[PDB]
Amino acid sequence: TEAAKEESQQMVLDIETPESVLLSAVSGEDTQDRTDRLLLTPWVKFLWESYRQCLDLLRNNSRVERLYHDIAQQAFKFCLQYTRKAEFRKLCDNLRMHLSQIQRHHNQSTAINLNNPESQSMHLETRLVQLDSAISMELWQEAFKAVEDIHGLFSLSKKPPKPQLMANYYNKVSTVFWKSGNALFHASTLHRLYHLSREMRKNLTQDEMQRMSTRVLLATLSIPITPERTDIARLLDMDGIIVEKQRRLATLLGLQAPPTRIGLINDMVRFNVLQYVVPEVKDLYNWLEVEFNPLKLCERVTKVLNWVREQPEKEPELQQYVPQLQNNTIL
Amino acid sequence: GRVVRLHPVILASIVDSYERRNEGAARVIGTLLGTVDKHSVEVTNCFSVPHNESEDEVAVDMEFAKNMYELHKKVSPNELILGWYATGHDITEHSVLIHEYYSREAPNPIHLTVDTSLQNGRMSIKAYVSTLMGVPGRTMGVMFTPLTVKYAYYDTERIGVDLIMKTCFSPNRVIGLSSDLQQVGGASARIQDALSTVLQYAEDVLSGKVSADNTVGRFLMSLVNQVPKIVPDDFETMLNSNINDLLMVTYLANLTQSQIALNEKLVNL
Amino acid sequence: HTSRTLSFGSDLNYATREDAPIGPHLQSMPSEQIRNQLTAMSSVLAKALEVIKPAHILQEKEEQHQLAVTAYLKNSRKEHQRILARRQTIEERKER
Amino acid sequence: AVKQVQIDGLVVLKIIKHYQEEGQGTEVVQGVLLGLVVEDRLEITNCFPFPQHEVQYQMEMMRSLRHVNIDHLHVGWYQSTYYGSFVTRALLDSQFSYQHAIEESVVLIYDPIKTAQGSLSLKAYRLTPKLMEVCKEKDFSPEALKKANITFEYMFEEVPIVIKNSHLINVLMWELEKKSAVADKHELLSLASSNHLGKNLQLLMDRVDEMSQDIVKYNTYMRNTSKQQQQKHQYQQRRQQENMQRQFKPPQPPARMDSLLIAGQINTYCQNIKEFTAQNLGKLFMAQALQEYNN
C-alpha cells in the first residue's frame, strides 16, 4: 500500500479543462482523490481485509492472544492514516462479536479466563486505543461506543483493574466530555480523578500534587452556572429527557448520581484540596462563591485569570477554561 | 461523639412500646440505628424487643437482637448501630451487664435514659455511654459517662408534628383532620394570640416597665423594619390581578369538570 | 434604552422559580420580599414571645403541664388492661 | 364499610421516616398499615414500610409484631406519590388484593410535597362496594357497567380521620415543646406558589389530552360501526334481494375501564387545585389587611 500511494502520488506530478468543469458541478473532488481510487484504494481494501480475516481466525484462544491484541492496535494505526470511515464501524461490530463468544465458550482447553487480570489488562489496552484513535477520526459516537464497551469489562472481570490503566482512562473520558460541550461532566470525571490519583503513587511530589489539584476547581469554576436548555426540549415534544439520559451518563462513568454545581464545589473544599493549590488561584472560592462584593469581582477575579493568560507555554492545561469562567463573571 | 442528635420518632415509639408490655417487668431492651459526624450522633429509628426478667439475670435473645438489625437492613443499608435505650432514671445491676454485650459487637454504645415520670419532675432524658479500663483482680467499679441528647426537626417533620401537637389543646385528645381555610383562619388566631403578648407589654413598656427596655426594644423596631414599603396602588395590581388569576382557575377547573361530567353523562348511556 | 438605564427589581408581579442559585447573599429584591411577608410577622413575633418573658401565660403553661403529667398517672393501667383485652380481640377476630 | 378511620401517633411519624431518610427525588415508597377495628372506627396504631424493588417479607414481620405483644392485624396499605397523581390501575389492583382478605381495607396516600407547602395530605379513602362489585364478577364490560352502575362520584369514597393518642404522648408533647429550639410555624402562609400550581395543572393537562385521545378514537369506533351497520344492512338489502330472484367482524370499543380511570384521576385534580385556590387566596386576602394601614 505504501508503494502504491507514492506511485499514485507522482501521477499527480505527472499530470500537472472542459472535462473538469462539469464534474465540479456534481461533486467536489481533488485530482489526488480521483487517482487514489484507481491505483491505491483496491490495495487498502485488501489491506483492511488482511487484518480483518486474521482477527476472526485467531479469536478466543488463550495462548496466541498477544498476537490478537497487537493485531487490533496495528489495524487502528492503519485506518488513522488511510481514513476508512465506514470500516471503523466494521471493526466495532466484530469487536463485540468477540465479546459475546468469550461469555459462552468457556469450555475449550484454550478458552479465555476473564477473571485473570493480565489478559483483561490487554483488553483494556485493546479498547483504549479505539478511544484514542476515534478522537483522531471524529467518530464521536464511536468514541462514546468505546467507553460503553470498557465499562462492561469492569463487570466482566471480578477484580477491579490496575491503577495505571484507569489513570489514563479517566484522563480521556474527561477530555471527550469537554469537546462534546459538557463542562458539568468534565469536572465529574476530574472530581473522580482526584479521588483516584492519590494511591497509585502516594509520595510522588507536591508539584505533581500542585499539578492535579488546581485543575479540578478550574473544572468546577468553568462550570456554566446557567443551566442546560429545556426550551428546545419543550418545542420538540421531549420533556423530562434530561433527568433521563444522564443516569445513563453518570452510571457509565462509575459514579451513580447526576452532578450539580452546589453539590460539586462543596466536595473539594471538603477534602481541603485548597491546601494543595497554586496560591494565585487559592482565593477563587472566596471571591466568586462566598463574598458579596458586587463592585469588586470585576477587577479581582480577572486578576487571577490574567495570571492564567501569562503562561500558555509553561502551564497550557488550564487554558481551555479561559473564556468559560468569564461567562460566570457577568452573571 | 459529644452531642447526640435524637429525632422525636424515637420517643413516642418508646411510650407506645412502654404501654404494651409484659406485666411487671420494668425495661425494654432494644437497639437503635443512625449516623455520625463525630460531634453529632444522629439516631433515626427504633423497635421494641422483649427480654426475660429474673433476679440478677436479664436474658437477652442474641438471635432475636441480631434479627431486627438485619430486618431493618433490608429497609436501608446505610445505618450503623449507635446504641440502646433503657427505661427509668434508676440503674439496677441488670443495666451494666447488658451494655457490655453490645461492646463485643463494638461501637461505643450510645445509651439513653428515659423515664416514665419523675414524681415531682418531668421527663428528664439524658444520653449515656459505657467506656472504662481494668485493674486485674477486682475491675468491678464502673460508672456512666453522660452526654447531652438534643432532638432535631426536619421540614415535613416540623410541619407534620404541628397537627400532632394539637392533641394537647383538646379534652379527650381528638382533633378531626383539619380543613385548609379554618387553618388559614387559625393562623390569624395564631397571630391574634401572639399579637396579644407584645401589645399587652407595650402599654407596660410605655408607661413604667423600662428596665430591660433595649432587648425588646431592638426586636420590636426590627419587626416593623423587616417588612418593606409600597404605596397601595402598587399592591392592587399585584393582589387583585392574582385574584383574577385564582378566580380564573376556579372557573376553568369547573369548566373542565362539568365537561368531564357531561362527557360522563354521555358515556354512561 | 431611552435614558440608557438598567433596572433591577421594580417589577412586582414576578412569581419566583425554584432553580436559581442562592449564592453570595443580601436582602433580596422586593418581589421576593412582598411575597413571604406574612412569614416575617409569623417568625419574629413568636421569637418576641420569648423576650417579654410574660408572667401570666407561664402559669397557664405549668398548670397545663401539671394536669397533663398527672393525667397519665390517673389514667394509667386503664388503657393497658383494655389493650390486653384488645390483644385477645385480635385472636378472636383473626380466627373469625 | 368503614365510617371512621383513626390514627395513633406512631403510624404518622414513621410515615415521615420513610420519606425523610429513604427516597428523596421523587419515589413511590409504600408500606402496610396496622390495627384492630373496634366497631364503626378503623383504629391505626402502626405501620412498617417496604423498600423500592414480598408476601414472604410481609408475613415474616407478622411474627415480629406478635413477639412484643403489639397488634398484628393487617388492614390496608399506604403509598407515597407525586403532587396530585396517585390513581393508577396498579394500586387499585394492589388494593382489591387486600379488600379480599379483610372486608375493610384502605389507602392512606401520603403526599410529602402538599404537607411541605401547606395542609396535611394523607388521603384516607376506601373502596366503594359498587367498585368492589365489578371486580368480583370480573366483568370489565360496558353492558354490566350500566346495570352494576359506576359513575365517578362513588369511585373512591373518603373516610375522615380523627387523631387519637394516650396521655403520656401528651406528656411528651408537653415535654418536647418547652425543652426545644423554637421552630416557628410559618410555612403554611407562604403566598408564592405558581409551580406547585403549575405542575398541578400540567399533570392535569396531559390526562385531559389523554382524555382527548380517548374520545377522538371513540369517534373512530363509531366511525367504524356507523359504516359497518349500514354496510351490513346494505348486505341485508343485497342478499335478501338475491334469494328472491333465484326462485365480517364487528369492532371492539376502547375498553371502558380506562375512560372511568381518567375521569376519577381528573377528579383528583379538581378537588385539590380548587382547595389550593382559596388556600392561596386566603393568604392573599389577609395580606390585603397587611398593607392596609401603610400609606
PDB file of N, CA and C in Angstrom, chain D residues 119-152:
ATOM      1  N   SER D 119     -51.247  22.324  54.057  1.00  0.00           N
ATOM      2  CA  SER D 119     -52.063  21.414  54.858  1.00  0.00           C
ATOM      3  C   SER D 119     -51.573  19.971  54.792  1.00  0.00           C
ATOM      4  N   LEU D 120     -52.043  19.176  55.746  1.00  0.00           N
ATOM      5  CA  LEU D 120     -51.656  17.778  55.834  1.00  0.00           C
ATOM      6  C   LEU D 120     -52.403  16.988  54.768  1.00  0.00           C
ATOM      7  N   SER D 121     -51.657  16.369  53.855  1.00  0.00           N
ATOM      8  CA  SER D 121     -52.240  15.470  52.866  1.00  0.00           C
ATOM      9  C   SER D 121     -51.830  14.035  53.192  1.00  0.00           C
ATOM     10  N   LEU D 122     -52.714  13.346  53.893  1.00  0.00           N
ATOM     11  CA  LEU D 122     -52.892  11.910  53.823  1.00  0.00           C
ATOM     12  C   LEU D 122     -54.291  11.714  53.278  1.00  0.00           C
ATOM     13  N   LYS D 123     -54.448  10.858  52.282  1.00  0.00           N
ATOM     14  CA  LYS D 123     -55.756  10.704  51.668  1.00  0.00           C
ATOM     15  C   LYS D 123     -56.271   9.330  52.050  1.00  0.00           C
ATOM     16  N   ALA D 124     -57.127   9.288  53.079  1.00  0.00           N
ATOM     17  CA  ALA D 124     -57.648   8.034  53.620  1.00  0.00           C
ATOM     18  C   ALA D 124     -58.951   7.753  52.901  1.00  0.00           C
ATOM     19  N   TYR D 125     -58.854   6.990  51.838  1.00  0.00           N
ATOM     20  CA  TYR D 125     -60.003   6.664  51.027  1.00  0.00           C
ATOM     21  C   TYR D 125     -60.165   5.156  51.074  1.00  0.00           C
ATOM     22  N   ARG D 126     -61.340   4.691  50.691  1.00  0.00           N
ATOM     23  CA  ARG D 126     -61.680   3.288  50.805  1.00  0.00           C
ATOM     24  C   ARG D 126     -62.448   2.964  49.532  1.00  0.00           C
ATOM     25  N   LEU D 127     -62.664   1.684  49.269  1.00  0.00           N
ATOM     26  CA  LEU D 127     -63.330   1.296  48.048  1.00  0.00           C
ATOM     27  C   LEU D 127     -64.831   1.348  48.257  1.00  0.00           C
ATOM     28  N   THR D 128     -65.522   1.876  47.269  1.00  0.00           N
ATOM     29  CA  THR D 128     -66.956   1.742  47.250  1.00  0.00           C
ATOM     30  C   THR D 128     -67.328   0.290  46.933  1.00  0.00           C
ATOM     31  N   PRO D 129     -68.456  -0.199  47.474  1.00  0.00           N
ATOM     32  CA  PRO D 129     -68.895  -1.571  47.164  1.00  0.00           C
ATOM     33  C   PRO D 129     -69.253  -1.812  45.707  1.00  0.00           C
ATOM     34  N   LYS D 130     -69.734  -0.798  44.981  1.00  0.00           N
ATOM     35  CA  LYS D 130     -70.084  -0.997  43.576  1.00  0.00           C
ATOM     36  C   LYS D 130     -68.844  -1.106  42.691  1.00  0.00           C
ATOM     37  N   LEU D 131     -67.718  -0.526  43.120  1.00  0.00           N
ATOM     38  CA  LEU D 131     -66.433  -0.850  42.504  1.00  0.00           C
ATOM     39  C   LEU D 131     -65.798  -2.113  43.079  1.00  0.00           C
ATOM     40  N   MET D 132     -66.202  -2.534  44.277  1.00  0.00           N
ATOM     41  CA  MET D 132     -65.938  -3.911  44.697  1.00  0.00           C
ATOM     42  C   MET D 132     -66.814  -4.905  43.925  1.00  0.00           C
ATOM     43  N   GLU D 133     -67.982  -4.459  43.444  1.00  0.00           N
ATOM     44  CA  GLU D 133     -68.924  -5.340  42.756  1.00  0.00           C
ATOM     45  C   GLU D 133     -68.422  -5.757  41.376  1.00  0.00           C
ATOM     46  N   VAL D 134     -67.819  -4.827  40.630  1.00  0.00           N
ATOM     47  CA  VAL D 134     -67.479  -5.095  39.232  1.00  0.00           C
ATOM     48  C   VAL D 134     -66.272  -6.034  39.108  1.00  0.00           C
ATOM     49  N   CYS D 135     -65.377  -6.053  40.106  1.00  0.00           N
ATOM     50  CA  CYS D 135     -64.177  -6.888  40.056  1.00  0.00           C
ATOM     51  C   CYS D 135     -64.396  -8.280  40.618  1.00  0.00           C
ATOM     52  N   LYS D 136     -65.408  -8.458  41.466  1.00  0.00           N
ATOM     53  CA  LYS D 136     -65.689  -9.787  41.986  1.00  0.00           C
ATOM     54  C   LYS D 136     -66.315 -10.659  40.908  1.00  0.00           C
ATOM     55  N   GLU D 137     -67.216 -10.096  40.105  1.00  0.00           N
ATOM     56  CA  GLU D 137     -67.734 -10.811  38.946  1.00  0.00           C
ATOM     57  C   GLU D 137     -66.760 -10.817  37.770  1.00  0.00           C
ATOM     58  N   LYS D 138     -65.728  -9.951  37.824  1.00  0.00           N
ATOM     59  CA  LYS D 138     -64.633  -9.819  36.848  1.00  0.00           C
ATOM     60  C   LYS D 138     -65.181  -9.497  35.451  1.00  0.00           C
ATOM     61  N   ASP D 139     -66.229  -8.685  35.399  1.00  0.00           N
ATOM     62  CA  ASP D 139     -66.742  -8.229  34.113  1.00  0.00           C
ATOM     63  C   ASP D 139     -66.305  -6.782  33.950  1.00  0.00           C
ATOM     64  N   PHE D 140     -65.185  -6.569  33.262  1.00  0.00           N
ATOM     65  CA  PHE D 140     -64.816  -5.224  32.824  1.00  0.00           C
ATOM     66  C   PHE D 140     -65.402  -4.999  31.429  1.00  0.00           C
ATOM     67  N   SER D 141     -66.734  -4.931  31.414  1.00  0.00           N
ATOM     68  CA  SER D 141     -67.563  -4.956  30.232  1.00  0.00           C
ATOM     69  C   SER D 141     -68.579  -3.825  30.299  1.00  0.00           C
ATOM     70  N   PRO D 142     -68.817  -3.122  29.182  1.00  0.00           N
ATOM     71  CA  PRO D 142     -69.769  -1.992  29.207  1.00  0.00           C
ATOM     72  C   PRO D 142     -71.236  -2.372  29.377  1.00  0.00           C
ATOM     73  N   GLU D 143     -71.633  -3.635  29.176  1.00  0.00           N
ATOM     74  CA  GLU D 143     -73.058  -3.960  29.265  1.00  0.00           C
ATOM     75  C   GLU D 143     -73.525  -4.117  30.716  1.00  0.00           C
ATOM     76  N   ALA D 144     -72.695  -4.718  31.576  1.00  0.00           N
ATOM     77  CA  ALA D 144     -72.975  -4.791  33.004  1.00  0.00           C
ATOM     78  C   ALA D 144     -72.538  -3.536  33.737  1.00  0.00           C
ATOM     79  N   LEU D 145     -71.766  -2.660  33.073  1.00  0.00           N
ATOM     80  CA  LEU D 145     -71.277  -1.430  33.695  1.00  0.00           C
ATOM     81  C   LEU D 145     -72.417  -0.487  34.034  1.00  0.00           C
ATOM     82  N   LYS D 146     -73.480  -0.515  33.234  1.00  0.00           N
ATOM     83  CA  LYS D 146     -74.640   0.340  33.447  1.00  0.00           C
ATOM     84  C   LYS D 146     -75.652  -0.277  34.410  1.00  0.00           C
ATOM     85  N   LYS D 147     -75.725  -1.611  34.497  1.00  0.00           N
ATOM     86  CA  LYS D 147     -76.612  -2.242  35.472  1.00  0.00           C
ATOM     87  C   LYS D 147     -75.981  -2.224  36.855  1.00  0.00           C
ATOM     88  N   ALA D 148     -74.740  -2.699  36.958  1.00  0.00           N
ATOM     89  CA  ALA D 148     -73.918  -2.511  38.153  1.00  0.00           C
ATOM     90  C   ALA D 148     -73.259  -1.146  37.998  1.00  0.00           C
ATOM     91  N   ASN D 149     -74.057  -0.107  38.288  1.00  0.00           N
ATOM     92  CA  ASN D 149     -73.775   1.253  37.842  1.00  0.00           C
ATOM     93  C   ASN D 149     -72.606   1.860  38.594  1.00  0.00           C
ATOM     94  N   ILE D 150     -71.620   2.327  37.829  1.00  0.00           N
ATOM     95  CA  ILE D 150     -70.471   3.054  38.347  1.00  0.00           C
ATOM     96  C   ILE D 150     -70.362   4.351  37.564  1.00  0.00           C
ATOM     97  N   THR D 151     -70.601   5.456  38.258  1.00  0.00           N
ATOM     98  CA  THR D 151     -70.337   6.804  37.790  1.00  0.00           C
ATOM     99  C   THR D 151     -69.434   7.409  38.858  1.00  0.00           C
ATOM    100  N   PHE D 152     -68.698   8.451  38.486  1.00  0.00           N
ATOM    101  CA  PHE D 152     -67.417   8.737  39.118  1.00  0.00           C
ATOM    102  C   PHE D 152     -67.500   9.350  40.518  1.00  0.00           C
TER     103      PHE D 152
END
